[PDB]
Amino acid sequence: YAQSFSKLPPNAPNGYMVKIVGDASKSADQYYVRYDAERKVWTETLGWN
Amino acid sequence: QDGLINVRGGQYGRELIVHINGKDVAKYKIPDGSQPEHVNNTDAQWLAEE
Amino acid sequence: GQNAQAKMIAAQTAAGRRQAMEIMRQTNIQNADLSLQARSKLEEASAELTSQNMQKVQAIGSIRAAIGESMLEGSSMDRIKRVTEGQFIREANMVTENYRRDYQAIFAQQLGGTQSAASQIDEIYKS
């Protein structure tokens, strides 16, 4: 759970998953992004469970 | 289940503490910085390994 | 007073040694600040490149929407989107390269500072 989008580390394990939850009280900024080792890019993807 | 510890860099004279499950598992004191050998001590990867 | 002369000179060894140690402390600390600045620059580059990505989502989306209702399709209709996607790729390549130049400048500055500290320590030692 990382508050802001920029809080994500520049590099991470390939399968890592992080949720933004920007506001923590509104559903406007809730989405998940997973890292991509080979491309070195955080890709928005479907959430866990 | 898991977490990460992003290391932006190292600054001389500071202390690094990692608190997990109520325990200060990791404690490192970067030297003052007078010796050139402290370059490894302040290096991001060397500090992450330590 | 030979002892007085020895004490005075011993103070010079103390002056030069602590002066040299401080030269390394100041040079080593400045380098860390430059490294942190480079990291912050990388973060800023990432943020602006993400903004470029988000604009791309809407841009290529509109190209697909209009080229999708046109009723023409073909090779020219795909060349329209291909050229557009390329512009975004090149623009991001420039953000990723402006960062490389800045990091190179920081690298050169750090080497210059280290060499200056080295020369100053040689001067101190030479007495």
> What letter does residue A28 receive in the DSSP assignment?
T
Chains that touch C (3 or more CB pairs under 8 A): A, B
- Which residues of chain A have a CB within 8 Å of the CB of C42? 10
Q: How far is A9 from chain B (nearest CA, A)?
A: 6
Task: State both tokens at C8.
Answer: 């005075």
Breakpoints of chain A, after residues (C–N > 2.5 Å): none
CA distance A3 to B14: 26
Task: State both tokens at C111.
Answer: 């080497």
Output the DSSP codes for B3-19: ---------TT-EEEEE
Greatest extent of chain C over all pairs of C-alpha atoms, in Å: 105
- H or E segment at A22? none
Q: How far is C118 from chain B (nearest CA, A)?
A: 10
| Resolution, Å (one decimal) | 3.2
Asked whether the beta carbons of residue A6 and residue C42 sit closer than 8 angstroms, the reply is no
Residues of A with CB under 8 A from a CB of B: 9-10, 12-13, 16
Output the DSSP codes for C43-80: HHHHHHHHHHHHHHHHHHHHHHHHHHHSS--SSHHHHH
